[PDB]
Amino acid sequence: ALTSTPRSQLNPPNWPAVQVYQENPAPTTVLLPRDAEAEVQMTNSGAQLAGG
Amino acid sequence: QAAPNRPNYIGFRDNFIGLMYYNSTGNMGVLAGQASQLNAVVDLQDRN
């Protein structure tokens, strides 16, 4: 009574979506290195880039 | 008659210029961080 989910068909063949443990981690914060909205202007000025 | 052979000094080049080659792109060296592997050295073909 404390633990099991109250259901009619014990041993069901197809479990529902909500009664199964899901996996919801944190939203992956991605650090973009170099925003290219002003970086493609730097190369078109003539400076070739390197490093990084 | 015998004349001595013409003297020749097969030594290294001055300053070993020609032992190592950058500034001929393709087979040039890189200097990059380990985490990134993007070189800080790219050459131009016409740059001595």
UniProtKB/TrEMBL annotation, chain A:
The modification Phosphothreonine is found at residue 5. It is found in: Virion. It comes from the Viruses. This is Hexon-linking protein-N. It comes from Human adenovirus F serotype 41. The gene is L4. The chain holds residues 60 to 111 of 233 of the full protein.
Automatic annotation (TrEMBL), chain B:
Transmembrane segments: none annotated. It comes from the Viruses. Induction: Expressed in the late phase of the viral replicative cycle. It is found in: Host nucleus; Virion. Homotrimer. Interacts with the capsid vertex protein; this interaction binds the peripentonal hexons to the neighboring penton base. Interacts with the hexon-linking protein; this interaction tethers the hexons surrounding the penton to those situated in the central plate of the facet. Interacts with the hexon-interlacing protein; this interaction lashes the hexons together. Interacts with host dyneins DYNC1LI1 and DYNC1I2; this interaction might be involved in intracellular microtubule-dependent transport of incoming viral capsid. All late proteins expressed from the major late promoter are produced by alternative splicing and alternative polyadenylation of the same gene giving rise to non-overlapping ORFs. A leader sequence is present in the N-terminus of all these mRNAs and is recognized by the viral shutoff protein to provide expression although conventional translation via ribosome scanning from the cap has been shut off in the host cell. Major capsid protein that self-associates to form 240 hexon trimers, each in the shape of a hexagon, building most of the pseudo T=25 capsid. Assembled into trimeric units with the help of the chaperone shutoff protein. Transported by pre-protein VI to the nucleus where it associates with other structural proteins to form an empty capsid. Might be involved, through its interaction with host dyneins, in the intracellular microtubule-dependent transport of incoming viral capsid to the nucleus. This is Hexon protein. It comes from Human adenovirus F serotype 41. The chain holds residues 294 to 341 of 925 of the full protein.
